[PDB]
Amino acid sequence: QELVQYPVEHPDKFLKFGMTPSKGVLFYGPPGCGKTLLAKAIANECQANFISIKGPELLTMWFGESEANVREIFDKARQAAPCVLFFDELDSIAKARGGNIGDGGGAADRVINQILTEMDGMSTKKNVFIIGATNRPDIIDPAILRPGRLDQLIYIPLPDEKSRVAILKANLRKSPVAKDVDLEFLAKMTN
Amino acid sequence: LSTAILKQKNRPNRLIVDEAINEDNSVVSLSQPKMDELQLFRGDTVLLKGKKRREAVCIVLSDDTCSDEKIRMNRVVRNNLRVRLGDVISIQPCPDVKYGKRIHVLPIDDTVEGITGNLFEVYLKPYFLEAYRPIRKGDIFLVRGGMRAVEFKVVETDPSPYCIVAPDTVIHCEGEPIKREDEEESLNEVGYDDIGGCRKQLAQIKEMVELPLRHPALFKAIGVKPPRGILLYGPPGTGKTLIARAVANETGAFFFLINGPEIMSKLAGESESNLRKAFEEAEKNAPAIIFIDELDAIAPKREKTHGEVERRIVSQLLTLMDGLKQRAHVIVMAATNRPNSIDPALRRFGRFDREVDIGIPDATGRLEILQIHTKNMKLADDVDLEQVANETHGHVGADLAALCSEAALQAIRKKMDLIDLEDETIDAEVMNSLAVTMDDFRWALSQSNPSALRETVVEVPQVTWEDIGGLEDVKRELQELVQYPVEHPDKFLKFGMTPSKGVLFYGPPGCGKTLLAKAIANECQANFISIKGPELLTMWFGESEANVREIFDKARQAAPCVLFFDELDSIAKARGGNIGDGGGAADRVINQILTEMDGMSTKKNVFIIGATNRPDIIDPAILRPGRLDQLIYIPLPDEKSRVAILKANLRKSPVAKDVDLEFLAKMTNGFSGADLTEICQRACKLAIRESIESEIRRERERQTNPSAMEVEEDDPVPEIRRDHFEEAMRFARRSVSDNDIRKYEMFAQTLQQSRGFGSFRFPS
Amino acid sequence: LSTAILKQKNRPNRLIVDEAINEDNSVVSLSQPKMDELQLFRGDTVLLKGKKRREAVCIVLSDDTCSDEKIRMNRVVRNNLRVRLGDVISIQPCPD
Amino acid sequence: YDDIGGCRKQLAQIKEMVELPLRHPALFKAIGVKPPRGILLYGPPGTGKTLIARAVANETGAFFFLINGPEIMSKLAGESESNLRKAFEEAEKNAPAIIFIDELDAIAPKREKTHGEVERRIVSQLLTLMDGLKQRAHVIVMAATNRPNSIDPALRRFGRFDREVDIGIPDATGRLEILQIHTKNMKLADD
Amino acid sequence: ARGGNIGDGGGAADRVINQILTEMDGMSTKKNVFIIGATNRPDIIDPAILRPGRLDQLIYIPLPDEKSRVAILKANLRKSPVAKDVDLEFLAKMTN
């Protein structure tokens, strides 16, 4: 909340102090653990747009032109503020190049580099918040985990006991379920 | 020596105009020495000379009731002079003390209507019957012959400079109604005061031009060669035609504008006729100017040029420009956006050699532009244009007009409750009780896409030394290389030393390797071009040699620059690094930097500073004499520098009184220069949280007693308020571990121990 | 008054569509104070508001038999006002 | 006005930009603020853009003039340019007008598509007419294209097509409005 | 700049030195053009140029010994007004 909502609902507080709003987060956790449902859930709170940017399409850029669409993707979010641009699978290029590639190449990959050019050339006044998500939080380029860019890392753990009850009651909503089913029980053995 | 050209060169008869309490147009207020200085004979007519030759005169009398350097008139003469209060006019009797022969007046409908009568009987006989109310030939003046403002035009007049119109002057009464806005058509002649963000780039125009026009005799006879082409260029929308009109109309020079697309919007074999008929009457009239606007549209590079009928206009333009000879006294100036876009054949000598460079306005250019644009709006008290000028980053001299527009529209939209949708009875107070606040300006600022956020910014930075503190040796050894070779050049000729052309910093990441470059650039008032890592690594992923040349050519036209190539090693570590592959650092880009760093004359004062997080994996070809020569090692901040960094981060935000920065910096030992900026932000997100929680808790609280009427405490948390740093210091992470600062100390110690001739001592 | 232009001026005499069973194409069933608020005398014609300047006017009579909230009209004028039953129609006299 | 669906978010922006300059000419001229010299709508083809222009202009009391794209680029070389003039010439004579140059990416493509000379003489004839507009004429041009970068970049310069709305694909609740517009004649069953 | 005995295998040819060979051979000796090279790594140099008909011999330029250092110092100290009691014969004798 304090990264997507407060810099929107109370922008005057951010002027009383000299604090400057953050422009990035980086979720990382076990794959398939509701890392996408958290971008939408916060985007639903502050009533913001939500542009989703997946793996299999970023990796398309690395197999040809780059740097002519990453410019346009951002300029789409700039005309539709406040967005929550969600670069899913930021490591997708890295593990598709070798995962510590043998020939030597360290971090730069012609596409993650281009995001840096746009991310810096974006005044914080526009309320565009970039959220990444990775399952391999080490091969990610160390040039984005630096102040001024995606700053921190939030670790999304596996659902524990209370989410699993809620996760089940979300999938079983459209399907007529029996009244003697105990989701309070089925969520207590699946551990 | 460079911008000394705007000297005023005062004369004794310079008096600042003022207001007169009498409707009489022929009131003069003088200093007592002024009456008897120019021998001002009472009752005669003295010539008043404004700007753009906008003039109107008055009878000189013994009325010294005003101050010594002020003169009182009413709206007629002052406005016909077209100068405000704060502009002097040389009151001087020109011997043309004469009456007009025949004048023709052009009435303006809204001014004349009300009391109309007959033109002669009501306004021309008695308002001019021996009343010594003089006017100038060819003006649009004001007649206070009725109940309110009544305006006419001067058309015909025997004394061209100035005259008194009498009943001897027979005035034709077939005048036609004119418009208030018709005056604006002629007044589209811009004065000199209407350019902002070009305090510097206008001195260059005042020196290249304005000398060879106001005195053809001087530069013609001495045999010096005036320019015959100026190529202004900058980002689109910085108002260049405005600059051309100012420079032209300000020096009394006919200004003929050739439009860009309006040339090729015409038939094949017809555009050439237009170019010829432009260059052939510009040479005809007077010392003139041609402003070939949007040049890159009628002379692109060869590749964008496709047909032959389009490579004929270019050749016609060339043969017309080489038809300029010293008799013609005509000066052409064009306007592209970058020097590359124009056809290279034009830059050859004799056509478009000298090349001024308008650019993005800087942190005070925006302020002054905003003051230009907002002299018609009715600003509320709490508007602080010095504040909003700091916010607008990428905007140019055109986006600020749109920002003012959006703010005014935001106010006119907050015109909401009680004026009917089709209410034509918009009260005049609506137009004169507008209150544009900071709310409207921030609203507008949040909505405007800036035009030119993708341009390198060449402007003096606003950092000082005590934002770093300490570094008492790097301070001197960086002075001796950027300040001495600028402020004291003669020493470098008295001895034989050639100035160095580079320094290579190296140290742990985030230690002030940028604040040092900005600080030293500030010290000697030198522009500061910064080239970050991605802006190079992008070059390594495609073309090279097409931007690096551009970077150095940009640096050349802003001497003295301090070009700062941050992360020089970026390619070397993005190409494996220290393991990599087969390569002797072998870079497609760095080699280009070497090529341009050799072909660079030392006399131009362009000092190149690098910065590498790793001092060894870099190419050894730069660390060779003649290029970036010596290495400065920037250590981690130690004691005074940490206090300075904390007090420079906490200078924007309200801090408490007992916050002991002198202790906080005394405790945190191994902290970077960018890990004390998260003990100073994460100490503010623990206050934004607390204030924005207390507000909501108070709001939900008082719904228990909505009738209390004693609510809304002024401030729950006004202050960063120690016991926040107590908590924010729980998320303080040392960036550089002690196992990684060894690699730099055990390098710097190796630069030493290869030195020390010590016991060296000349004999006797 | 420097924060005011967005007024639409909703009126106390705004008349909403009500169905009629009459066949006369310019008879209006109005509120009782309709002749009274603007002092609307008999002998003139009002300018009923539709959309797109595509309107249809009536002869206004002292026929105030309707209620104070709506107007009873046939198909002709309301539809020839180029507004379906469900569009705002405002009453205003026209001295033409 | 109410025959447009799924555009309530963007059609609000056209409300602020156009009707205030058009139904209150004096207020702009009095305060001196300047109305836009041209809007540039853009979105995927067939989202009903040539209707929005009629919507805005048919209910604000403003003469409307439609210039088609293929209508211009299909006449004799040298006759098309005349038709552009006899449109701007005629519109300026009339009331506050709205010229809607539909299919603008056909009469002014990227240069990289323009190859003939007469193909680049219409574009210039357009630009001189556009910048020939000033506050006297009281005309507000507005265009339509599918993607913003598929237009000649010389048009976006200031004074021609400065500001640029973006009609987008209708959202999940926008469609419900459209379907209730195209089925107000059908006899839908109760189910 | 290619690897210094590059790993992938490439032995001598580098697309540029080869061109220098092609032009060097196609140039009659009558024209008085003398080609002087200079290298710091005199083993990785392509063995196809150290062949008769091309750059033939090698001359090893040693470090300055005692007199060349005096001359170098007096050449560098020419434009700068020096004191008259400076002993370059000593400063060139310690720097070894």
Residue numbers in the entry:
A (entry chain F): 490 to 680
B (entry chain A): 12 to 775
C (entry chain F): 12 to 107
D (entry chain F): 203 to 393
E (entry chain B): 585 to 680
The authors write:
P97/VCP is an ATP‐dependent unfoldase that forms a homo‐hexamer machinery extracting ubiquitinated or non‐ubiquitinated proteins from macromolecular complexes, membranes, and misfolded protein aggregates for subsequent degradation or remodeling. VCPIP1, first identified as P97/VCP interacting protein, is a multi‐domain containing deubiquitinase (DUB), which harbors an N‐terminal OTU domain, a middle UFD1 domain, and the C‐terminal UBL domain. VCPIP1(VCP135, Valosin‐Containing Protein‐Interacting Protein, p135), a P97/VCP‐P47 complex interacting protein, is strictly required for both ER and Golgi membrane fusion processes regulated by P97/VCP‐P47.
We finally obtained a 3D reconstruction at an overall resolution of 3.45 Å. VCPIP1 interacts simultaneously with two adjacent P97/VCP protomers through its UFD1 domain, and no other region of VCPIP1 was found to have contact with P97/VCP in our structure, in contrast to the previous prediction which suggested the C‐terminal UBL domain of VCPIP1 is responsible for P97/VCP binding. The partial UFD1 domain of VCPIP1 observed in the cryo‐EM structure folded into 4 β‐strands and 2 α‐helices. Moreover, the aromatic residue Y623 plays a pivotal role in mediating the complex formation in interface 1, the side chain of Y623 pointed into the hydrophobic pocket formed by the side chains of P626, K754, M757, and F758 from the α9 and β4‐β5 loop of the D2 domain in P97/VCP.
